[PDB]
Amino acid sequence: AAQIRQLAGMRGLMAKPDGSIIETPITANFREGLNVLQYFISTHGARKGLADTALKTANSGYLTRRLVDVAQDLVVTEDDCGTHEGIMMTPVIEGGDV
Amino acid sequence: YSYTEKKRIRKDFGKRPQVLDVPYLLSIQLDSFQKFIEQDPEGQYGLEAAFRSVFPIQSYSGNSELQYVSYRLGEPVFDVQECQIRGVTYSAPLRVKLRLVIYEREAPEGTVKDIKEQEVYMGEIPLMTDNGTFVINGTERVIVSQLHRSPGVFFDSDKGKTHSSGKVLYNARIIPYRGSWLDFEFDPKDNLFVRIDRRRKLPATIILRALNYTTEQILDLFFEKVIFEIRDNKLQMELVPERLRGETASFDIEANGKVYVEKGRRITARHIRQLEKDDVKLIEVPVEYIAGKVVAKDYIDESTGELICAANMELSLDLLAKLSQSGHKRIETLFTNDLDHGPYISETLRVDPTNDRLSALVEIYRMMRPGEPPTREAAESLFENLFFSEDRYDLSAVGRMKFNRSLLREEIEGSGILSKDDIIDVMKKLIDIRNGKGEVDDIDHLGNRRIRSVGEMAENQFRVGLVRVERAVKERLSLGDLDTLMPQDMINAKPISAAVKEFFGSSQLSQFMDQNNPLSEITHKRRISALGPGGLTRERAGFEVRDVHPTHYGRVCPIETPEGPNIGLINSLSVYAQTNEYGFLETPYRKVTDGVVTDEIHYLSAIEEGNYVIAQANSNLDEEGHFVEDLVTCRSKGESSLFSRDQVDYMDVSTQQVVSVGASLIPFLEHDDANRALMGANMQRQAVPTLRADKPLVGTGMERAVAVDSGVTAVAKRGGVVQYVDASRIVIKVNEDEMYPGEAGIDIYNLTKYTRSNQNTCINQMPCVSLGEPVERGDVLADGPSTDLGELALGQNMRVAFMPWNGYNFEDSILVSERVVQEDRFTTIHIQELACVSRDTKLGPEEITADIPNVGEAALSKLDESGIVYIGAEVTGGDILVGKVTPKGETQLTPEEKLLRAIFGEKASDVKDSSLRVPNGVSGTVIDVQVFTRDGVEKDKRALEIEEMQLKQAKKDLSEELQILEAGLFSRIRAVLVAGGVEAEKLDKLPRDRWLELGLTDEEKQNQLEQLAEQYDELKHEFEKKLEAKRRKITQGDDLAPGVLKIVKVYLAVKRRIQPGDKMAGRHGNKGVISKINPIEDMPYDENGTPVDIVLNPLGVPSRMNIGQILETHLGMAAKGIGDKINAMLKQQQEVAKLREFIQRAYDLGADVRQKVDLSTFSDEEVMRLAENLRKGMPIATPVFDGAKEAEIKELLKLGDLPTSGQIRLYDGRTGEQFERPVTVGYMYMLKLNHLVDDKMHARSTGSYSLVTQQPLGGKAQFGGQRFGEMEVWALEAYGAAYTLQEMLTVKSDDVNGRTKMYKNIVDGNHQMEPGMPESFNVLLKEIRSLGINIELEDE
Amino acid sequence: PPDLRPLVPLDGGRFATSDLNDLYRRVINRNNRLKRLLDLAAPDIIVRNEKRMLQEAVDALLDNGRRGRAITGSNKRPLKSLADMIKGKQGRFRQNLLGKRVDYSGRSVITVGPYLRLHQCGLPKKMALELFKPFIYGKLELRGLATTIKAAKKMVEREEAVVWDILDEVIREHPVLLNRAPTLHRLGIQAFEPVLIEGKAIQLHPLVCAAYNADFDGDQMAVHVPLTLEAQLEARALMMSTNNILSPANGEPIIVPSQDVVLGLYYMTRDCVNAKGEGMVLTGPKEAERLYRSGLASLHARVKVRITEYEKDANGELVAKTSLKDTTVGRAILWMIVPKG
Amino acid sequence: ISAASFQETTRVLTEAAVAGKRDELRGLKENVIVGRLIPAGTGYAYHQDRMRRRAAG
Amino acid sequence: RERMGHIELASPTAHIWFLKSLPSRIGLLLDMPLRDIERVLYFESYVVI
Amino acid sequence: IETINKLNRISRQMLQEMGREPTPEELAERMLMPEDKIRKVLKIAKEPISMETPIGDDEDSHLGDFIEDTTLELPLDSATTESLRAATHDVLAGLTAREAKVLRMRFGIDMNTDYTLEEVGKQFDVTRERIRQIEAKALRKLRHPSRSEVLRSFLDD
Ligand SMILES: [Sr+2]
Ligand SMILES: [Sr+2]
Ligand SMILES: [Sr+2]
Ligand SMILES: [Sr+2]
């Protein structure tokens, strides 16, 4: 539903190089012709979001490499372990919603 | 409209008129290189800047010097076409005028026996081609422009993770164009430190002490001084009203008895009025207030001569009492607070261990060179050579300009070396920002970032080459004789040529020309990268430089950039942007004179934009001057907001200035997402030329601009009437208007036919003009690989229907009809080069004759007369091209093989087959062959007969050029002869060679015939000069690598057609892989029965957010909508005037547009020829932003009797039943890009292995194996797999005994591993043992 | 050993030597000089200096990046010492896992395979002939078609019609692993039984494409072939896609229809206000197909259909409940696809 | 053997030499380097045959 | 590929892996800082045994 | 070494006096030595290249990584050698008793030493001239297309 918003309704608000949100959002949707100023505004999030994606695989790939090297030397040894002890499990409720 | 434009008029849907037309697209490359080869006297640009910087090289060790006059170029060894064939670097020999000067010790300067040399060889510099490239070793290469920080002065904050609390610091950085780095920074202890060449931290006062400044002089330059006075035993002070404000005084401030501020009282603003009016100059101060303050000057006892207190020292109760004992009158201190003034320089002096000038110079020497003990002569020499020597340190022309710009100076001109006053001024400004009054400049700002093109980067590489030479020159002057060893012998050309060649074809910014298409050829030349020397690496500067800065606007394209690891570092240059006089980026603007808008064009830099209010191109203008609306959307000083008409100073030239050429060709960019327009621009560059290029139905208008500026298309220099058309040569007769007296008015345009590219694609120049057609300057005569009539034609367009199929369009997958394969519309020509090198070994020399001991005569049927394959022989993957044989020796036959030799009879002694074979696969046919021989010649019969063909063809090529030039020369003579004396029937009977002697009475026309007779003799003279040079090059013994006899290169043109697996993409980012070639039978068709060409997945549109591909489809059927009605006519043959009305109606749709096509006043011949070109659809141009409206496409659809919605009911080919919902059908421009499935498919079972590690390796016959990484190992560890990983590590990889034993088990039918020790661990064991550490395997 | 630090003649004629060889020479040279100096007059200054460099010579040989930094005799580079052979991101210890080249491996661009099954992939004909090269020779001399190994080699290279028939026999019942870069979880490598298809492109099943992060636009996959019976079994019993229909991360299935399949079932099940044919009784789900493909009723509109649903019994299975349900025409046809239980 | 795979190599090899450490090859990463069967899955039943015969012999 | 050789040293030379690598294997075994070991090894000062 | 030093001194002279580059024909004239000598030294004077020379980098690769091993025989050729010895054993089995023993001594098949015609004659009961007759008799029967169809396939090498 988020993709349909930009194409037919309204694109929304865009960000600045500092991190703050711009005063006036892009009113034009992809059905009509976007302005020269509006398109240059929308490019910032495109070349920043994909720039994060370029190093997302490297950062998450190192996280996958990290968790392996500590737990790789672990295999099932016995069929049953003689302890009647575990962890208490309760359904996660945040405030008043399950 | 021009005649070349009249044949095909493109319907433009623009609204804004073009004020400034699109300039030369490769102006960045050509204009910058011409600065390098420029013969500019004082204007230091290029070579003249490099020579005059070092020369005249002087040496007072032997009292002798060498002087520089001027340099020479020209006379190239091989032409641009000749360099590509025989493999020569396109360069001109550089010869420089040099003279040695001898001095005798008697007079100030006494010259004795001066010897001058005319020309000394100093290597050869590569010249730029006609388009904007360099031919190195044979291949065409491009120099990429560098993006770096501009030389001058920088100011940075950096307030991230520092100290602990997060103290904000301020850093001043003086960066030169050539020299050492100067850094001035504050530390967490508030003190100031200097960093020389980015090394250890020295106190800030150490650089001043080295410049001969005493401790008294250091405190004098920066600080305000308070003067304490000793009058009649009691202590007093000079009062300044501004000094005491806000701070509470612990003492009674009194003047002549009257008390103003007493003990325990605050000072606000009221007290700074009573003291000012009463003329107070002196007040009484206690001993406590003076104690703690820092003294400025040295005060000694004038009775004894001993130091009481030196400069920069703390005061106490005892020290002030001794000053009264000595008999002093004045004491000088410093004024430092905590807000607007601080003791940053004062507190550093105590930290500074140095005492005088000598001590400071040693400490700088010890930091730079921490090894040898320095003397006074050595310490003074290093510091003067750091930032004060001309030969070492230089700010250049741009550096001093920006250096004085930031520091706020009167002059922009100055010397390259920094003076003593300049260093202090940078230090003064840094304290100002620390105090409060001061601004921090942006690093990402384009006004602080320069562009190093081709000529500027080649200048720096040539300068260091002269530095490499100057060491050998000055040292050998005093070493040897100065009577015999004079001119040429002093300087060697070897160090110069080695430095230049390691830049044009070895540097990071020097790559192969991406000649997949004319668009990729242009975009690569205007690429701006921040990865060059003295720039930034891949993992540096963070992510701030990668992000888009508001300064990029109309200088750098925000969407067109590599989407890989580079993102931001490499950027494409926008259309209208150019380089200024100081290397900064500038964009043109319409000048507004407070009201009306004039067509005055002004180029403004990034610094200049932060002052004027710039209006957007989106606003409409009344009549042609002033605006319509009072409230206009504008942009000023970075930010963009609404502004009034009077406040507007500038305006955008066009709505195309923000987007580069690569993404300018995208039709509906406004309806596309910025992420997919980023990708869509990259897909167009990878496009491979089809066999027959076809015009894009949905264009932008830049298609014609790309084709001409690329240089791949043959354009008319003059014009006129075409005389003779051929598929190799286009000759033209000049219209006499642009023909200047002297030579004949005929231009010869030689066409390049079927030539290999860098990406192995085909380069072809097909003719366009017919015999007897009038054309002018700028007219397109021939088309390149991916160009149609005048315009760019990347990869043709097909019928597109957005509908799901039976799983053949699951994810991005695209279907194709058999008609796409039947009709050559996506057939690509690929020319491949294969080389066979006969080499000399220690066993014996290799031969290249048709005497193969293994195969014959089965593969030898293709090969001809003892050597290589014949020209025009169709060969498949496995045939023999060049029959190479290699001596091996020994050849010990095994007992079983010895028996086999006696049974049948075998001849295989020393001769081993190692012939050049066609790579294992499917290939086309042989186009051309070339044989290169050693300096000893020893010509083969096949190599000798081809040189006979080379000599005869070159003889004909030069003879045909003379014949036409002679014909037009004497035809011009007849025009002069008839004018004055009419002999139209008398001259025709007389022989044409006896026309030179005849002429009119000695007048002005006699002088006209003088130049015509001189040129005729000149053409006959230059013909013999060109033929002698041409005969020399063919008979020339080709110089090659040592240990090489003959190199034979066989060229093959593979005609590969489209198949499932090939990568297809649109213009908007919609890429995909071809699923299956479906017949014309089963694929959907219209009500009239027109079958759809390609079927694309409709699901990959809303999530992709690219509507540009949909509007290209709607306008695609609309484009052919008019075309089909033109196609419906002419076949039945209707009246020309009846056809004229419909065409005129087509170019004027939507009431009011912009493009006004001539109102039916074209000639009957021109209208019929235009309708023939518009038969296969109408070319529609839709600009980058101000393009075709949504409602305008619907109006054009009704013209060709088509629905406005774009969706039509289709019928299934398999069933025959209706699709229960109308499907949108039209024409989208598809692209068959590079890296096809034929080049991507690789397979290996067994082959060759590497030497150091016994793991799979690719080279010949079979392809290389796939790498099984550690990420793939985790998968098998997560699975219950154990024997599969065992295979991956041993038998498939390194294990020597494992692989061969397992391979035999497959053939026997065993399927057993039997693994052992892998060679990956066996080498590892010996490496640990060789270190000196015992490692052993222990048993159970 | 000399093989690990080799002096081999290249294709051009110029030799290529290891950096270890250059380091070893500058150890023996001063070792021989010290043996000379100890018997040919020994002044302490020179002898201590010769012992000073000899200690550095071994130091540069073992680990160069510690005490100073040695420069190669011809090149301006730090020499690969004995320590630099093991470490340095890419050496000998680290290449045992990552930098491992593998035989019997292929690579091609992925394509869709809607006609294929879940355990089937569309492996190229020319790739499979190259991959199963030794497997062809094994089942060619066994058949009695080829005399020896060399005669079997000539039949494969000539692309004989009989070789294509034998090729299909070997591939049948022989699993083939398919790997995609990068592998984040274990389902990146799955085994498939190949079906021979002409072309240079490999076809993949649309359902298992959800397990990988793959999109048919320009992605490539590695083609690995197991060799032994143990390797063939652990590919079918463990690494097969049919065995791995669920995800190892969570209890939810990973093989779940997407895009075209979801859109197909959505249009089939959705209802309209008043489509063609409404208010019929319909005998079985078979008559629902009789009306749609003929052209008498649409997939939509609420039409009563006779259905026979089978619920799970306590022991299983005898429960067969038949009742009139108020669904659509399209929902009745999809029930035939749905299993009995 | 498992440590020097991802950790710093020169520190591990020196620590193993001084202490005189023995690698009995039980970890999964240990057996991949040497070219042996993984003590997991199919090779787990194989590995139990050799570990049981260390006490007796 | 398997056979190795040896070089007989005229003077005893120290191993770099046990000297420079922190925190010094020779240093901790003798209870002596690296600055004191290097000055003896490098030939600058004598040491009492 | 003296000739290599002599080469570099004249190379500086001839490069700038003529214009372009000194050819082996022109360089040999000033050195007073034949062309086959100069062109030989130029190859010897070149220093052996380092193993870890970076070529293009990008994915990180060295010169020593792309060097193939020519010493190793192909697994296909290794299976051919095993198949040849197995085929010839069945071929020699078809021969009439003593016919196999002669060929295994004359060519050294399955035996450590290769024997000459004189050595068989004294250790086979028969005369010297007869050995030449039965050798060709054993070969002729293996020259026949019907008997040796398997041996004809090895003729491709
Ligand atoms: Sr133009
Ligand atoms: Sr996906
Ligand atoms: Sr992808
Ligand atoms: Sr007997």
From Swiss-Prot, chain F:
Site Interaction with anti-sigma factors: list residues.
R106
Renumbered residue ranges of the record's region Interaction with anti-sigma factors? 128-143
Which positions does the record tag as DNA-binding? Answer: 117-136
Give the residue ranges for region: Sigma-70 factor domain-4: 91-144
User: Which sequence ranges are marked TM in the entry?
Assistant: none
Positions of the region Sigma-70 factor domain-3? 2-78
- State the compartments where it is located: Cytoplasm
Quaternary organization = Interacts transiently with the RNA polymerase catalytic core formed by RpoA, RpoB, RpoC and RpoZ (2 alpha, 1 beta, 1 beta' and 1 omega subunit) to form the RNA polymerase holoenzyme that can initiate transcription. Identified in a complex containing RpoD, the RNA polymerase subunits RpoA, RpoB and RpoZ, CRP and DNA. Interacts with Rsd; this prevents interaction with the RNA polymerase catalytic core and with promoter DNA, and as a consequence, promotes transcription from promoters that require alternative sigma factors. (Microbial infection) Interacts with Escherichia phage lambda antitermination protein Q.
Q: Which family does it belong to?
A: Belongs to the sigma-70 factor family. RpoD/SigA subfamily.
According to its UniProt entry, the function of this protein is described as:
Sigma factors are initiation factors that promote the attachment of RNA polymerase to specific initiation sites and are then released. This sigma factor is the primary sigma factor during exponential growth. Preferentially transcribes genes associated with fast growth, such as ribosomal operons, other protein-synthesis related genes, rRNA- and tRNA-encoding genes and prfB.
* Protein name as it appears in the record: RNA polymerase sigma factor RpoD
Origin species: Escherichia coli (strain K12)
Full-sequence portion shown in this chain: 457 to 613 of 613
